[PDB]
Paper text:
In this work we investigate the use of a monosubstituted amino acid in the creation of a hydrocarbon constraint using Bcl-2/BH3 family PPIs as a model. This family of proteins play a pivotal role in the regulation of apoptosis, play a major role in cancer development/progression and represent key targets for anticancer drug-discovery The regulation of apoptosis exploits varying specificity and selectivity of pairwise interactions within the Bcl-2 family interactome. The canonical structural motif involves a BH3 domain from one Bcl-2 family member adopting a helical conformation and binding to a BH3 binding cleft of another partner. In this manuscript we report on the use of a novel α-alkenylglycine derived amino acid to synthesise hydrocarbon constrained BH3-family sequences (BIM and BID).
For a full comparison, we also synthesized the disubstituted amino acid and incorporated this, the monosubstituted amino acid and aminoisobutyric acid (Aib) at appropriate positions in the BID sequence (replacing 92Gln and 96Ser). To ascertain whether the constraint alters the recognition of the hot-spot residues within the peptide, BID-MM was co-crystallised with Mcl-1. When in complex with Mcl-1, the hydrocarbon constraint in BID-MM is positioned away from the protein surface, hence not contributing directly to binding. The double bond within the constraint is in a cis configuration, with no electron density to suggest that it exists in a trans configuration (ESI Fig. S11†). BID-MM binds analogously to BIM-WT in such a way that the constraint doesn't affect the positioning of the hot-spot residues. The salt bridge between the conserved BH3 aspartic acid and a conserved arginine in the BH1 domain of Mcl-1 is also retained. We then tested BID-MM and BID-DM against Mcl-1/FITC-NOXA-B in a FA based competition assay. In competition against this different Bcl-2/BH3 pairing, BID-MM was less potent, with an IC50 of 1.6 μM in comparison to 0.39 μM with BID-WT, whilst BID-DM was slightly better than BID-MM, with an IC50 of 0.8 μM. Crystal structures of Mcl-1/BID-MM and Bcl-xL/BIM-MM revealed that the constrained peptides adopt comparable binding conformations when compared to available structures with wild type sequences and/or peptides constrained with the α,α′-disubstituted alkenyl amino acids. Furthermore our structures confirm that the constraints point away from the BH3 binding cleft and do not introduce steric constraints or new non-covalent interactions with the anti-apoptotic partner.
Residue numbers in the entry:
A (entry chain A): 172 to 322
B (entry chain B): 80 to 101
Write the structure that this text describes.
Amino acid sequence: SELYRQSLEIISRYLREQATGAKDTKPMGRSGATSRKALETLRRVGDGVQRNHETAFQGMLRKLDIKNEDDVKSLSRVMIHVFSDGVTNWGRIVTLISFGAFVAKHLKTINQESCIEPLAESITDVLVRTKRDWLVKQRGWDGFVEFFHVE
Amino acid sequence: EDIIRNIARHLALVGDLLDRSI
């Protein structure tokens, strides 16, 4: 879907830029204006989550023992469990993407960079497949940008 | 999935606290 591809554009770019330090300058799709703003929002909010919760994230990562593409699946299972209480909000969504970026950095560090795009797509799939109706009601990535706007 | 469930509860709390502040 268009929402899947836009979400993947944002999440894949954030995870890969976080892991490698290199911005992706390739042109975006037709929703690029919103995607650029959502990426800028993630750089602010998501970088903050990872730093503020680094110790906790490190412990979670250790317990997951992520070594290869067969382990990338565990993050999708974490996401499903987060949403199992029936609650959806942007704070949870950005926290899951931020943990995804933390895992992406780990994958680069262990020279499993080829696992990052599968991770980004796995996160995108859980979000869009299971929360499509909520995302649409919240006006999608435009709503995400508006929610986290300051001043 | 004991480990995964506990990680998820922790991330849910972090996410909810973040949402609260916004």
